[PDB]
Design a protein around this ligand. Structure first.
Ligand SMILES: [Mg+2]
Ligand SMILES: [Zn+2]
Lengths: 74, 50, 49, 241, 46, 98, 147
DNA sequence: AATGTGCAACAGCATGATCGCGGCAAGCTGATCGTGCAAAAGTCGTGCCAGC
RNA sequence: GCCGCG
């Protein structure tokens, strides 16, 4: 659980953009067709995406490249 | 002439609302009829008046 | 969604029960009422494209 | 005093006894033909184009000699209206006046408010300059400074630089600065709606939904915060077609 | 004196008082300023 | 499901405890003078009828416990949840923005 | 829906507000239009052959004197149809040009502000595409029943 | 030296004067006639055939 | 419309 979202904020620094990035990641994990890249502690998708951003393995650019890779695969 | 949705298509893309005076012909265009009798509801059959 | 969107309410409820948490917003009924009230004056107000 | 004054300051109300000011060179002129009307008519030549001011003689005159009185000098004692400060001493002078006088009200009681939050309010009172020269489809009318700045930029960029018309900035109270904005959907939800719709209905204007109350009313994402990013995507598509 | 059109530069405006860093683009500072000025007043002795 | 929630069996209570887990709900007091008058907290289910408020935040709300009442709103969207967690959380607004 | 009024009526929205749009469009005081709109006095139109002006506020006794002396050529009426007739006959561009020439030729602070206000309103009318005859309403809309 | 014009003072009118919340009664109160005739529609007392 | 609550 993310009591504070400071780490994600410095990872991508806007305090306004990480809301959008984490919303996109949480949508991907919640609608379907995606699995978390961080161990799951029975958290909701929200703080899971926040933890993924904090660990530095999710941002806007790599999300775009994964979307492009999925489009190229199909 | 089936499988029609009107509530969903009732929402149309828009931007930059505008305002101006309403011409009488445009007022006629809005209207679906003309009212002449003042009666609101009658009690003989509990229906709106003609 | 919470208050005035007539179809947004039902869509949001169905999305929640499904488990989607998707907004799908729309057009508040209060503003349509206001447009009809203004149009009922001698004033024309519309939604341009 | 009190704090029917943060209200009195922000509406920029003219006080009861304004203090008169002067121009570049205040030579001794006293008064020529001081009749029963406003006497002591001061006419400083200042080399060329003298300015004729009238004082009703019920208020004392401070600077008897010339002393090369410059613009912004205190011709007569009294509280100064902010409108006079902006016209003569400059934009930075009225900001320091309103900030210092408002902060005095809050400091005296013991309330800490940053000066940033007052300069933001003042910035919304310093719009709508009055144009005094012509050639760019404007002649002696009050238009927003933002539109006056962009018009000058395009006119100066082109070969015909002289078309660019200088302006006289104007100061408006908060109650009058909000009602005069370009979005008629706003300013119809705050004060007199009968007057705002009537002038909007005749002029046939449109809102374009640029502010916050316009977008809140129609239920769209506000152009601030997390909705700021979304609004930028829509703007570029509109320009591109 | 930000001279920008329909807004304020993030540098002309200082840092936001709520957080140590400089302000980010898209922060509605007009409402914040109005609320900051108007939150007192209930304790101004008129 | 509606009947089972109406009868409020024990499994309904367990599932409620599960859905509350990381869902911040946002409380506000009546005269919302500044922006700190509405803040998002993580709920803790308690057996009672009165909302329990952390004492430290009271100065922000201008709230004393002498009959004051507060309103609770649920941000029922993914984006709204992230906004409550990263913009309205009491751990986010520590300094007053004035 | 709509209502056919069978008789022209004025819009209180524009007639009765401190910067009366129709009043200053007509370049005549609010009291004269208020009196003529409630049948206290007549207003004449044209009548070039007779001595009556274009915008007379002649009353009933003056009307009787005119019809006894002038007889015909006196097109005087009272109702909102009077404002109809005197608004349709007004030419926007010619009036704007004449008032612009008057304002530019003579310099006077008292009349300058009124002249500029009139010019601004006239230009707004010609640019927005509205017809000033639409201020008063012949057909009146009605709200939907469920509102 | 008498005269026309622009500026200023006084009166009248429009506008707005915080946000949530809870509970209780009483008003909330509300009607355009008849008209007298065809024209239509409906209805009632009566007789009909089909099932047990 | 009245009464009260912060
Ligand atoms: Mg209390
Ligand atoms: Zn700037």
């Amino acid at each position: 659980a993310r009591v504070t979202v400071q780490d994600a904020v410095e990872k991508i620094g806007n305090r306004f953009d990480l809301v959008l990035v984490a919303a996109r990641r949480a949508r991907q994990m919640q609608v379907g067709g995606k699995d978390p890249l961080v161990p799951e502690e029975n958290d909701k998708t929200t703080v899971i995406a926040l933890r993924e951003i904090e660990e530095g393995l999710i941002n806007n650019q790599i999300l775009d490249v994964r979307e492009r890779q999925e489009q190229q695969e199909q | 002439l089936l499988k029609f949705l009107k509530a969903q298509t009732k929402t149309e893309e828009f931007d930059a609302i505008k305002i101006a005076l309403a011409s009488p012909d445009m007022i006629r265009s809005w209207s679906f009829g003309e009212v002449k009798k003042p009666e609101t509801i009658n009690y003989r059959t509990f229906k709106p008046e003609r | 969604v919470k208050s005035d969107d007539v179809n947004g309410r039902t869509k949001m409820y169905k999305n929640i029960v499904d488990g989607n948490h998707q907004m799908e917003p729309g057009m508040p009924e209060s503003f349509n009422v206001l447009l009809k009230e203004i149009r009922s004056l001698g004033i024309n107000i519309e939604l341009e494209d | 005093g009190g704090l029917p004054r943060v209200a009195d300051l922000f509406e920029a109300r003219r006080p009861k006894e304004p203090a008169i000011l002067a121009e570049i060179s205040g030579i001794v002129s006293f008064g020529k033909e001081t009749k029963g009307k406003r006497r002591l008519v001061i006419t400083p030549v200042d080399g060329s184009d003298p300015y004729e001011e009238m004082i009703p003689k019920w208020r004392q005159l401070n600077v008897f000699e010339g002393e090369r009185v410059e613009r912004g000098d205190v011709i007569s004692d009294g509280p100064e209206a902010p409108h006079d400060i902006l016209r003569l001493r400059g934009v930075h002078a009225v900001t320091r006046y309103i900030v210092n006088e408002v902060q005095d009200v809050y400091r005296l009681q013991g309330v800490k408010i940053n000066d940033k939050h007052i300069e933001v309010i003042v910035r919304q009172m310093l719009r709508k300059a009055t144009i005094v020269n012509a050639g760019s489809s404007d002649f002696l009318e009050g238009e927003q400074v933002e539109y006056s700045r962009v018009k000058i930029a395009n006119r100066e960029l082109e070969a015909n630089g002289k078309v660019g018309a200088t302006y006289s900035r104007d100061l408006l109270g908060i109650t009058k600065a909000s009602l005069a904005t370009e979005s008629f959907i706003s300013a119809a939800s705050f004060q007199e709606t009968t007057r705002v719709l009537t002038e909007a209905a005749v002029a046939g204007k449109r809102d374009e939904l640029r502010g916050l109350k316009e977008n809140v009313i129609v239920g769209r994402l506000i152009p601030a915060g997390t909705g700021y990013a979304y609004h930028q995507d829509r703007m570029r598509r509109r320009a591109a077609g | 004196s930000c001279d920008t059109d329909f807004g304020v530069c993030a540098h002309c405006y200082g840092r936001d008082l709520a957080r140590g860093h400089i302000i980010n683009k898209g922060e509605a500072i007009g409402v914040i300023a109005a609320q900051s000025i108007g939150e007192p007043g209930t304790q101004l002795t008129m | 499901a509606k009947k089972m929630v109406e009868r409020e069996e024990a499994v309904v209570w367990d599932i409620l405890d599960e859905v509350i887990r990381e869902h911040p709900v946002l409380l506000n007091r009546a005269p919302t003078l500044h922006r700190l008058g509405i803040q998002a907290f993580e709920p803790v289910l308690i057996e009672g009828k009165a909302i329990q408020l952390h004492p430290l935040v009271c100065a922000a709300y201008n709230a004393d416990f002498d009959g004051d009442q507060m309103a609770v709103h649920v941000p029922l969207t993914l984006e709204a949840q992230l906004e409550a967690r990263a913009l309205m959380m009491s751990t986010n607004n520590i300094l007053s923005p004035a | 829906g709509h209502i056919e009024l069978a008789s022209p009526t004025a819009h209180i929205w524009f007639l009765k507000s401190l910067p009366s749009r129709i009043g200053l469009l007509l370049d005549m005081p609010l009291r004269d239009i208020e009196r003529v709109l409630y049948f206290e006095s007549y207003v004449v139109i044209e009548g070039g052959m007779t001595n009556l002006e274009r915008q007379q506020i002649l009353t009933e006794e003056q009307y009787l004197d005119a019809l006894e002396e002038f007889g015909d050529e006196f097109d005087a009426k009272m109702g909102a149809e009077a404002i109809q007739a005197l608004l349709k006959s007004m030419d926007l561009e010619q009036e704007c040009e004449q008032l612009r020439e008057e304002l530019n030729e003579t310099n006077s602070e008292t009349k300058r502000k009124k002249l500029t206000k009139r010019i601004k309103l006239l230009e707004a009318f010609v640019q927005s595409g509205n017809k000033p005859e639409w201020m008063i309403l012949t057909v009146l809309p009605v709200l939907p029943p469920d509102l």
